[PDB]
Design a protein around this ligand. Structure first.
Ligand SMILES: *[C@@H]1O[C@H](CO)[C@@H](O[C@@H]2O[C@H](CO)[C@@H](O)[C@H](O)[C@H]2NC(C)=O)[C@H](O)[C@H]1NC(C)=O
Ligand code: NAG
Ligand code: NAG
Ligand code: NAG
Ligand code: NAG
Lengths: 182, 91
């Protein structure tokens, strides 16, 4: 029914440039240019949209809704790092601050009367790291139950070990289902 | 539920221009310019749209549908001369 997509805007990201020589026949080398943010530089910005494909028609505009990250992330530079469809009317978005030691899962529900995707504080789940970064290379992805009322996700133990925790979609506390020095 | 509207495009319509003198204090007359098609001139073109206002929200796109005239009119220059809502689902 829906097609979700992200749009990346690299307008202010500096370009790395380097020569590409190509085949021996090319008389003048080419200069490759790529928007590439080096440490501390301006980063690309992201927008996440959900398109309702039911109305797609040559004489119709596109029906879409932009979902923004929660306030605690929208506040500064951030990255979209995960997108998981839960049901046809529930989608899970995982965002992370640029510092990458604070991430949040935002579970948005489709409102049939307005076509909006609504978020609620009760459906948000925060994951932070005071001693490093969140996850191995990025936060682990949530794995929802068929009904979407709960999910399982790997997070760091009280002991620092990554284990599976069971979360209720609308509750903040989770329960670890695995444990151990592994 | 819906908001229908027309858009007129006067890009190719010639301009009638005339002086407007204004209050006596105005040192230089202004020239009023209006897209006005005289007999046989290029006319404004029109498009008709129906907006579904149920999805209007700050972060939503506008859901709209363009309704084009029947082939027998679409063929050449034409005008939209009337709009009548019949029911919530018929125009
Ligand atoms: C991509 O991001 C740039 C900002 O880096 C946007 O550019 C701004 O656009 C607004 C509206 O047109 C202008 O008022 C600003 O002056 C622009 N800023 C700069 C630095 O150019 C641009 O609109 C974004 N593009 C899209 C499609 O999202
Ligand atoms: C969509 O617009 C095209 C314009 O060429 C028109 O031919 C077509 O009939 C329109 N769709 C319908 C059937 O409403
Ligand atoms: C995250 O890292 C930033 C440094 O860029 C620091 O200001 C902030 O206190 C850190 N937050 C946590 C939860 O450790
Ligand atoms: C108005 O009509 C001109 C052609 O006369 C066209 O180039 C332009 O795109 C039209 N503008 C809009 C917004 O439809
Ligand atoms: C719409 O997006 C802006 C950021 O572009 C955000 O401040 C605002 O909260 C969003 N609207 C709602 C009610 O989700």
């Amino acid at each position: 029914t829906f097609l979700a997509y992200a749009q990346f805007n690299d307008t202010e990201v500096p370009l790395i440039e380097y020569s590409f020589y190509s085949d021996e026949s090319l008389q003048y080398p080419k200069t490759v240019r790529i928007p590439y943010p080096k440490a501390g530089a301006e980063n690309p910005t992201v927008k996440f949209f959900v398109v309702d494909t039911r109305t797609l028609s040559p004489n119709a505009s596109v029906t879409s809704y932009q979902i923004v990250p929660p306030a605690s992330v929208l506040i500064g530079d951030h990255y979209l790092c995960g997108v998981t469809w839960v049901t046809e009317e529930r989608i899970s978005l995982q965002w992370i601050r640029r510092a990458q030691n604070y991430s949040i899962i935002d579970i948005c529900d489709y409102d049939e009367s307005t076509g909006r995707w609504i978020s609620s504080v009760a459906r948000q789940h925060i994951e932070i790291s005071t001693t490093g970064w969140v996850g191995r290379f990025r936060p682990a992805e949530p794995h929802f139950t068929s009904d979407g009322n709960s999910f399982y996700k790997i997070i760091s133990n009280e002991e620092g070990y990554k284990h599976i925790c069971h979360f209720q979609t609308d509750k903040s506390n989770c329960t670890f289902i695995t444990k151990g020095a592994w």
